[PDB]
């Protein structure tokens, strides 16, 4: 085994790389939305910033479960990244949905990896998924709960409402 | 000929004269718009500065041919610039929609003038259409469909949609 | 189709489509030689340094033709990223060789898009080939060729000489 | 009992009394090996700052457990420090190998001293170890298991290799 590998168990390692390849995913669904708030039919370029953002934090997420795989001496497996069923997002408020579930898979995941974590006796485990993963998915899912019930009341379909909210996001 | 002619073609020379009334023509489009928005029962201040500035756009976009053709060696030849199709621009949107498909009759010319440079081999031509023209004619498409999809979901109408969509505009 | 496409060649936006994914693919691979060489059993933190900045470059790459697509009046279309084909790199001069190998499977994909695009005689995807990708993917071949001279110079096996060219890429 | 204890259990007490006297024995470990790497018979300046630096955070390890032991009403009970197993260190693999087994027998005990904790639900025990020893423990094991591999690269027996890994130490 790695020189550097102690109390690292076989499935811990292995659920990092499961989370590697599903942060790279959430990633691409973020980006694909992104792009799509740009196109001249769409035109929500508040939206389009938001997912961009988005997109770059699920990528660094992936990349710190790389860096934590050396550091703890398990060896990075990557797999192909599928592309989003559905790249036609429709509204704003739509799009929202659907990155709220998609934060809550993610979430669901993360709080799996802890549980085997934890059931193996990896406290350095358990740091990184409370202090790096945790926290910022439940801040997330406020973050975009809120958002869902502004344009809620704003006027979620296409409409001026819609229009105005894009606006704050900017 | 000019004392500096070299590999520049009459029909260039000619369409280059074609251009340069295009873009006059394009320039008074635009400043007739700019002050149909100044009108007291009109009162678009975003939209007549979007206007004036595109009106001073077109006009440099004429003056930098202007320039090509004393540096190809050609012959400036002015014609008359046209009164504009319309003295009255409608709502907002109708006048986007104007705008619109006049930026896409100017991008065809400077197409066709590409394919004329393209057939006489000329580089330099195809270089300055390329670089000086074309790239800039595809974001200004890429803008006012993108405002034109904007103003749409604001409410396209006078109303209170168009009022807010001018405010982004100033 | 869009209110801004023209001159837009169907087969020109699909060859967009595949450009994006192959763009992505290689920004994935040199992802994974990132973090190879910053495995505890490898450890070249020069090399490690220099493929995740070609990572970088090749996901704006991607993003911008996700751009140009929106330019156009195109529909991004976006697929499956396939995994790394190797997930351990071997030596340094392996990963250099398999990096010029997919610079030049990149830059053949590129030349046949600007072919495709000539044929169409679409002038503003030659520029944007020409100035956005052709251009870097020159500099980028010429300077791995060389990185592999200078390694082989400074003796390319693992050994001293693979430790100090390491170091210049720091 | 001290007025301040609560849920302080007596053998966690116990346990970083322990863990006191092995942070002060490693940082003297480190300290033996500083000094011998200044020897005029070895002269290795840069492997002598870097195990000066480490025998200073072991000493700082160990004060940091004696304020906790105040904080939580314990209290410090110092033992003698055992001298270093070795006098003369070897080469800088040597030492290297010696100062990974080192911090990962540490690592061992402050695991150890985990469970202890756990298994006497101290929540505020457990955030220390994790926060304040456990991850900077695996951050030295990684960085030490690095400079392993390095310097196998460069070269470990005595030579220009070591010689000049010396130098990115210093
Ligand atoms: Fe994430
Ligand atoms: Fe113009
Ligand atoms: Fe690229
Ligand atoms: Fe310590």
Same mark, same amino acid.
């Given at each position: 085994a790695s020189q550097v590998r102690q109390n690292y168990h076989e499935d811990c390692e292995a659920s990092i790389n499961k989370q *590697? @390849?599903?942060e790279l /995913? %959430?990633?691409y669904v973020y980006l694909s939305m992104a792009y799509y708030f740009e196109r #001249? #039919?769409? %035109?929500?370029? &508040?939206?389009a910033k938001?997912?961009?953002?988005?997109? #770059?934090?699920?990528? +660094?997420?992936?990349?710190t479960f790389m860096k934590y795989q050396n550091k703890?001496? $398990?060896? *990075?497996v990557l797999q192909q990244i599928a592309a989003? !069923?559905?790249?036609?997002? &429709? =509204? &704003?408020?739509? %799009?929202l949905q659907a990155a709220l579930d998609l934060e809550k898979q993610? @979430?669901? !995941?993360?709080?799996?990896?802890? !549980? =085997?974590?934890? $059931?193996n006796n990896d406290p350095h485990? =358990?740091?990184?998924? +409370? #202090?790096? /993963?945790?926290?910022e998915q439940v801040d997330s899912i406020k973050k975009i709960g809120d958002m869902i019930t502004k344009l809620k009341r704003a006027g979620p379909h296409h409409g001026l409402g819609e229009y105005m909210f894009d606006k704050e996001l900017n």
């Open positions: *590697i @390849n599903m /995913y %959430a990633s #001249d #039919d769409v %035109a929500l370029p &508040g939206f938001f997912f961009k953002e988005s997109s #770059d934090e699920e990528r +660094e997420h992936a990349q703890r001496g $398990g060896r *990075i989003p !069923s559905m790249q036609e997002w &429709g =509204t &704003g408020l739509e %799009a993610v @979430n669901q !995941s993360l709080l799996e990896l802890h !549980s =085997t974590a934890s $059931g485990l =358990t740091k990184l998924l +409370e #202090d790096e /993963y945790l926290e």
